[PDB]
């Protein structure tokens, strides 16, 4: 029964899920000065153009806008990844003030929220089997700031109210994820694991530089979320992020100077 609150929030995972405390969990601090430029990193192919999202639905941790994965529509290729992954899901994680809300931090900065665009290794078939390899999936994690609004977020942000609580889905179709992404692709990159249980170590983690500007009234809308189903005490969905973990015996790298 994890979740986010005092009882069964990140401190207590490892007892579900001892991988909690191993070599290459999420998410961690991204030291900006000890990252090492890779000269050898290829740049980050996106394509989305075809990209057919299906629905949306609050699964009593996050939103996720899920996508037509059974054929090669929306993929992410390059960078530092061998092969084609291809997008499943994304989601965010947020914060309850603005100060605090992304899983990744750059050199301890905390931004609002953090995007997470799922993708996995289509060399292992399909989604479950990609998770239990260590190169099965590719995370394209994107920082958001409070500021100007984000224009292509405003369709997610407008069916919120339809997905209130846990288990709630609603039709999200024709949704372009293009619209979510900033000017640069610069990044950086490092293995790590699924941010939430079971934190699997199947990660290719590629984090972007450049965080996207989104409203005030955009984010106050994902803290009107509920983490519980309908008909039962209100939990707001806010501080749905778990906090840096320990680098240990991994390198960030840094696909610009
Ligand atoms: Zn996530």
Redesign the pocket.
Known sequence: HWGYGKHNGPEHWHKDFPIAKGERQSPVDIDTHTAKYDPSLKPLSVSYDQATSLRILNNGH?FNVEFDDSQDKAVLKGGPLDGTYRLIQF???WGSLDGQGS?HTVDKKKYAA?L?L?HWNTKYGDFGKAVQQPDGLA?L?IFLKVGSAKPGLQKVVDVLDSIKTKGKSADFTNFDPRGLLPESLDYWTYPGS???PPLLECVTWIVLKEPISVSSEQVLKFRKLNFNGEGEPEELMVDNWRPAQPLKNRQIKASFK
């Open positions: 996050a989601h965010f994680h899983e953090e997470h799922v995370v994690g699924l941010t939430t």
